[PDB]
Symmetry: C2
Subunit: 329 residues, 2 copies
């Protein structure tokens, strides 16, 4: 068997929070919501790892970029576009870019340009618009027994966390909000807010990770948000077989929700929220007339309920599996 195609999703890297803790004086080194230099580095390193895998090991892709060999699509945010740019700067690094004349660089240090298209901000393909996302949560998640139960467990801490942080804390949604700020603060080596113990910080962060993952343990919620992208990735695999497409890779640059919704849709919901620069790949293999698929998440293969001992299944089986999911929803 030989690898003949890959479809990939990433979450973007470390980024300055939109929210902030009122009773703290955190600054972020960039504008709110922007990818930080740390975030750029995370994605670049992922690019290097992908080069070692899909170029060096599998030889699916060549060492120098072939035009029209990779299709890249991003959500309409600076952080996802810059994350894709940064990753591609790892996959095809300085030194490998095009030459003109007598082996002179087209661009200083032989950077390799690779086009990235962006969805509109209104697109629901890669990230659900915030208002539509919350609408789904209010309808399907916030009133679920699981969410209600966890809320009751955590509720005794809300008053104190609010008095400490300043920020309103009146439910798990608010905990998730401050949780992102504490995650980035910790990543950047900032002190804890005055009066916030490390144990309390840990608990807030754990609830944040629990909450984001819990949202997508419903296959319904997942399909609502991710059925479209999941179908599209599988169609990409098919287009590689039926000759309709000549790409060796499609790459969707997105968010934690993007990974969560696709995994949730395929009936293999993540147990923990995706950290920065998390990624998943659908790999397609060919052996004569036999085509098989494998599914990789954060460096490990994932077993779909239709897969065999070796975490593989025919493309035909994957298509039938998706068809029924579509029929179900």
């Amino acid at each position: 068997s030989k690898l003949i195609f890959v479809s990939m999703i990433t979450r973007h890297g470390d980024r300055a929070p939109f929210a902030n803790i009122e009773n703290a004086n955190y600054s972020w080194g960039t504008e709110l919501s922007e990818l930080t230099p740390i975030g750029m580095n995370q994605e670049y390193n992922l690019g290097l790892q992908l080069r070692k895998r899909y170029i060096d090991k599998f030889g699916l892709l060549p060492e120098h970029y072939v035009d029209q060999s990779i299709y890249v699509l991003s959500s309409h945010t600076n952080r996802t576009v810059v994350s894709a740019q940064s990753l591609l700067m790892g996959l095809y690094p300085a030194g490998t870019g095009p030459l003109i004349g007598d082996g002179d660089p087209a661009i200083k240090d032989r950077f390799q340009p690779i086009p990235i298209m962006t969805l509109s901000a209104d697109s629901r393909l890669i990230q659900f618009p915030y208002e539509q996302y919350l609408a789904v949560l209010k309808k399907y998640v916030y009133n679920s027994p699981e969410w209600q139960n966890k809320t009751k467990e955590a509720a005794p801490n809300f008053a104190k966390w609010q008095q400490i942080l300043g920020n309103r804390i009146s439910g798990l949604n608010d905990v998730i909000t401050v949780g992102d700020v504490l995650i980035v603060a910790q990543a950047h080596g900032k002190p804890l807010p005055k009066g916030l113990s490390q144990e309390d910080a840990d608990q807030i962060i754990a609830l944040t990770d629990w909450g984001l993952a819990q949202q997508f343990k419903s296959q319904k919620v997942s399909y609502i948000m991710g059925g479209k992208l999941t179908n599209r990735m599988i169609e990409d695999l098919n287009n590689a077989v039926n000759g309709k497409s000549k790409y060796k890779m499609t790459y969707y640059s997105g968010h934690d929700l993007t990974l969560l919704e696709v995994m949730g849709t395929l009936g293999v919901p993540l147990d923990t929220a995706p950290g920065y620069a998390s990624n998943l790949e659908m790999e397609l293999y060919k052996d004569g007339d036999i085509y098989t698929v494998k599914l990789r998440y954060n460096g490990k293969y994932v077993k779909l309920p239709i897969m065999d001992k070796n975490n593989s299944c025919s493309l035909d089986a994957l298509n039938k599996y998706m068809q029924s999911i579509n029929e179900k929803f």
Copy 2:
């Protein structure tokens, strides 16, 4: 006075033609329609020139990229996106990118976000069928076009037999002309039986044709009114505090430059070469704001501008309002 804001449009660089000459065996070193390495270099060099101007000379922009200081928007093609990427690699080159004091990315590349319009957007490039519909309606039956067609018509039979490609009007001449322009830029031989004089002639008609399309302010406004308004609004937003950008940059095509210049009532006399560019510059001196218009390295005099190719922002707004009202 001090420069406080700039809005810029570019045409992309050298790219492999979509069409080809049937009786020739040209290959392009990339897939059809893709930016070539030559094209990347053209845009990169433009970036370097822009750094010398707006960073080194005017100091509008700093030497290391400030997030949210530049807004970049491109048409939905590989060649326009890659052209913007390449230009920005000149404006903020290897060595200036962020640190974590170690490089965030090998050789300190500086990532700068580029958004893309949808393929059906009419802002930067009119979709092909809509563009041709405009031409069929307003251009192809114009006396200028008819007359030029009659002058060139005696050559159609010959050019068709030589090239293989259908040649039955100026539209077909423009098509093969694109191919001959790229062929010559890449040092390829002329098709067998095509004289240099004939090639020059085909290319001259091509440049004439593209420019002629936009000497109508109406055709220009139809295709370019939206973007022209948007650029002027960008300038106003720099003054009214609505926007914190120091520059907006629209990555486009020859048509994009042609339509904006045509809308402003200063239509180009010749078609934009690869990597051509236009900038609206905004200056502040106390409470006085003024604007200048730069195309391919030279200032352009709007009919409302003074001896120094400048006018108040207020005047530019009034001038555009009237154009809007006119159409």
